[PDB]
Amino acid sequence: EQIRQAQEELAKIATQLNENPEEYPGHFKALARIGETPILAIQKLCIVTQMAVYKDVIPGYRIRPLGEKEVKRLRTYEQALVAGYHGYLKTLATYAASSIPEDRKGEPISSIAFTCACELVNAVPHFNFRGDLLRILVKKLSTRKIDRDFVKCREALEKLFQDDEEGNASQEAVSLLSKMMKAREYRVDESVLNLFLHLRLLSSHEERERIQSEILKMVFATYFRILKARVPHLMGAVLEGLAKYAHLINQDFFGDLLEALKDLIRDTDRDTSRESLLCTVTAFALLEGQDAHNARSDLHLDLSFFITNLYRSLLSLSLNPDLELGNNKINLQTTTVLLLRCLTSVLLPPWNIRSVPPIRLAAFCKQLMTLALQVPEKSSQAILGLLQDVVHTHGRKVAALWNTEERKGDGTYKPLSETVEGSNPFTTTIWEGELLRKHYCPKVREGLKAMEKELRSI
Amino acid sequence: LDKWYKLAKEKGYRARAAFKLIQLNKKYGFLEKAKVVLDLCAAPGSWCQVCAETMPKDSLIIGVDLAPIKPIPKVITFQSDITTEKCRATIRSHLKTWKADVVLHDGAPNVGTAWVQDSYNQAELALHSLKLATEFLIEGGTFVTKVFRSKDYNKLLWVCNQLFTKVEATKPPSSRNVSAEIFVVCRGFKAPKRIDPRLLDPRSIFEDLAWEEKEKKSKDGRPNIDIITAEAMTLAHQLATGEKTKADLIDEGYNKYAFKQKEGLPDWFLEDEAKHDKPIKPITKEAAQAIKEKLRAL
Amino acid sequence: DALQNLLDSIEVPEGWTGLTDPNTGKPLNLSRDELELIRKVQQGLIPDDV
Amino acid sequence: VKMIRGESGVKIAASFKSGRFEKWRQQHRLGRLPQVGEMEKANLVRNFSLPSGPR
RNA sequence: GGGAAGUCGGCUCCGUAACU
């Protein structure tokens, strides 16, 4: 058989080039001629074979072009390495650029060469022409099609972002991902935005600091034009991406991100309920940064503008029934948990848990009773299951509302106020707990007794 | 005498085999978190000098060689043959209850007899280091071995795939380009509870394999009436304000370039005429601001 | 009207000049005959009819 | 400058970085220490473990 | 290395037998 004969010469090439790769550059050329004959079974068997050959022969250091006994013997083998390995890539580039579908018996040329390229790019890094191997990966990630080879390249790239200590391959990757979407028009499936998240270098010193300085500046400029682009699903990953990596860059630029999202609040105030809530747990996460809370005395990062935005929008969030839809901090889709992670961070901060203003406790719990009226069932228990924890931690500071002897008589209650301290909830007592006994007893009423039992236990 | 040999005499290193080790460790960093290094064929002590230069002043360095090594501080060296039971008992007595973190090999036979025999001697000496690595190394340890590239280098690399998770073959640039040595570094020792004797037997390993549609014409004339240039809008501003009337506009329109032919002439003749008949008229900042608002799109 | 002004800002009329009329508070708009007179003056192909 | 009392019994300034950790950090040539949150190193526990117990 | 100074300094785990 020709296939059996081609397999025999392929193994003879593979054994001789792995026993001693020096003596036979003509084996490398004949391996290219076997790799260039058009028989589909031979093309599959060849490509996997000299993929593992160049997995075994590529040295640990880079080789310069020659330009211009044993020393000349080395260089002729050295140019034979680069020219043969370079001839892999356009062959791989043409193999990648060709069509996918064929008969169902096997993956003819696309998935097998992409798997070979993904395995090759998990070892090439230190060597050159990785960008040509990367440009194949940008090309396939640009097709906007979910596939097995798509998640293979995503897993292959996220290995390099979690392995490359030098980061030069990481820098070459993110530069092409920026060139991916300045050439195109904000049309990723958000996958490269998570690929920014598995980058380890964001999470020799002078070269590494310059490598950090390049990757910090360009990739944040990528999200900077995404915020100008205003793509809704890209916002969720970007605000997730901005929440993690905001503390590295300097004081004035990091405070500019707050001013940037403040303008996004004003743009929404001109979908919009979600986008504000995507921006809501975002800015609460930046304050939740341990170095950023240590930077409470190294920056003003203040949320008293932002709670007032939530307070005036608690009515509109109660009216919308779109709350429930089909280890992440920001990128959660449903606004029920987004409201929870908001309203947890407002009445129960991680840092300074017991240092909360009183009128903020009285007003947000009173409006929580109004939220307990117009809300679906699943959002109700978690809203319920939050507010015992508010009372069990605070107690007497909010218990003035439930008891009418502890009621201040300054002025009548104004439910529609522009400021949290504008309403005076110490005058009104809470009766919406009675309205929730009328709500389905089996589930809602449980939390009510748990709310009142912890209230008496104080 | 090369550059690395001259740097050995300047830095006090005994040989240039030291400079292959540091630049190997600069690539990986397997010596900065280790307590024990089992140095096999450590002559003249250059690899012990690197291992002494990088660890804790409370960690253990054991060097084994067939030749007597001069004493090095913080390094314990003794003379024994690495394939003997007395050697592994001496290492065990030195190690006591402590397992090796890194196992190094700088083995090289007396080359000069035959290239095939020297490579086979180097390949088996790397294998005598390979079983010595297996019971002394701690889990997750490092195994670095110098070996010549030869026919059995495939076989030795295959056993490294079996017993170790991550294995690389690398040429230090500090090594000789003429020399056919290659350095294989193995990481992640899998800790098997049973090791195949044929996986540790030189005779077995080195065996050779064998309706309404009437439309009026108004959407095309209107772009031709729409103002484009600033001079026309200045005339439009002068017409809108009570300054110039219809008679003044016709009279000002009667320039020197009137009563001309513009229909029956070729394209190139009228293009040159259109480029060279433009009059200069005064403009205003109000017209310039208004034409900027007109040209400003969404 | 606010909707009429918003529609005028998105698509300006043919006679729009951005000028406030000295007679009326509404902005002054050129007539069809005035716009044809400006085009005939600028082009110069027929300044005077018949 | 806040004033405290040291082990030597001499009144030492409160925030004094003597240099022993810096000396410690090349005595065994350890790398950078973990921040709060990162995993322990199975090396770093066995490098500096406890003794058999009778001190 | 020594003397001085200051201290509060020196004077449970493996195997075996019944029970869960």
Side-chain angles (χ1 to χ4, degrees), chain A residues 6 11 14 21 25-26 30 32 35 38 41 52 59-60 65 67 80 83-84 87 93 96-97 101 106 108 113 117 123 125 131 156 167 169 173 183 221 229 232 236-237 241 243 246 255 260 283 285 289 292 295 321 326 349-350 357-358 362-363 372 376 382 385 395 399-400 409 411 415 422 425 433 442 447 450, chain B residues 8 12 15 17-18 29 34 42-45 52 56 63 67-68 71 73 89 100 107-109 112 114 123 126 133 140-141 169 172-173 180 188 191-192 197 202 210-298, chain C, chain D:
Chain B
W211 301 111
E212 301 170 357
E213 59 184 0
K214 195 173 184 178
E215 192 150 329
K216 298 181 178 181
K217 289 188 174 182
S218 63
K219 294 174 181 175
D220 296 337
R222 282 181 180 180
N224 287 329
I225 309 167
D226 194 82
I227 314 164
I228 300 172
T229 56
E231 299 172 351
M233 145 94 86
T234 306
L235 290 169
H237 164 79
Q238 285 169 345
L239 178 55
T241 326
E243 302 175 2
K244 304 186 182 181
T245 65
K246 170 174 183 177
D248 306 308
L249 280 180
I250 292 169
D251 286 349
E252 287 184 354
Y254 261 47
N255 287 325
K256 278 188 181 173
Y257 306 104
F259 278 110
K260 317 287 269 191
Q261 211 166 89
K262 311 190 170 188
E263 288 186 357
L265 301 179
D267 290 327
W268 49 269
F269 184 83
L270 296 177
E271 271 176 359
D272 283 323
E273 285 287 300
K275 281 177 186 176
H276 296 294
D277 71 330
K278 288 184 179 182
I280 302 172
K281 289 184 178 181
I283 56 170
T284 49
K285 294 180 179 178
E286 299 167 350
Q289 179 68 45
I291 201 72
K292 277 170 187 180
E293 293 169 357
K294 179 83 170 189
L295 285 171
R296 185 177 295 276
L298 182 62
Chain C
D1 289 330
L3 284 180
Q4 272 182 23
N5 285 352
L6 272 172
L7 278 179
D8 281 357
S9 54
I10 289 184
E11 304 170 336
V12 307
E14 191 178 9
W16 175 85
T17 50
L19 300 175
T20 310
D21 203 27
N23 292 337
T24 48
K26 307 181 175 181
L28 181 55
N29 270 11
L30 299 168
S31 62
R32 168 147 283 197
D33 296 338
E34 277 175 352
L35 283 157
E36 286 176 339
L37 271 166
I38 293 164
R39 181 193 65 85
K40 288 188 165 189
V41 158
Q42 180 61 73
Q43 295 273 60
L45 60 94
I46 298 171
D48 207 295
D49 292 330
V50 200
Chain D
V1 185
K2 286 182 182 177
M3 284 311 294
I4 65 170
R5 208 165 210 280
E7 237 295 11
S8 298
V10 67
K11 241 178 256 176
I12 299 154
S15 54
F16 196 22
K17 328 291 154 173
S18 68
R20 208 134 199 260
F21 202 163
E22 308 73 333
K23 168 298 307 173
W24 171 249
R25 253 200 276 107
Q26 316 115 316
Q27 150 50 251
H28 332 274
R29 272 135 279 181
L30 291 202
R32 186 183 164 199
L33 301 203
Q35 281 128 307
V36 165
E38 306 47 30
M39 292 315 78
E40 93 267 25
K41 305 82 208 201
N43 304 350
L44 250 53
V45 51
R46 67 161 161 284
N47 304 13
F48 324 106
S49 52
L50 80 151
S52 181
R55 283 190 168 182

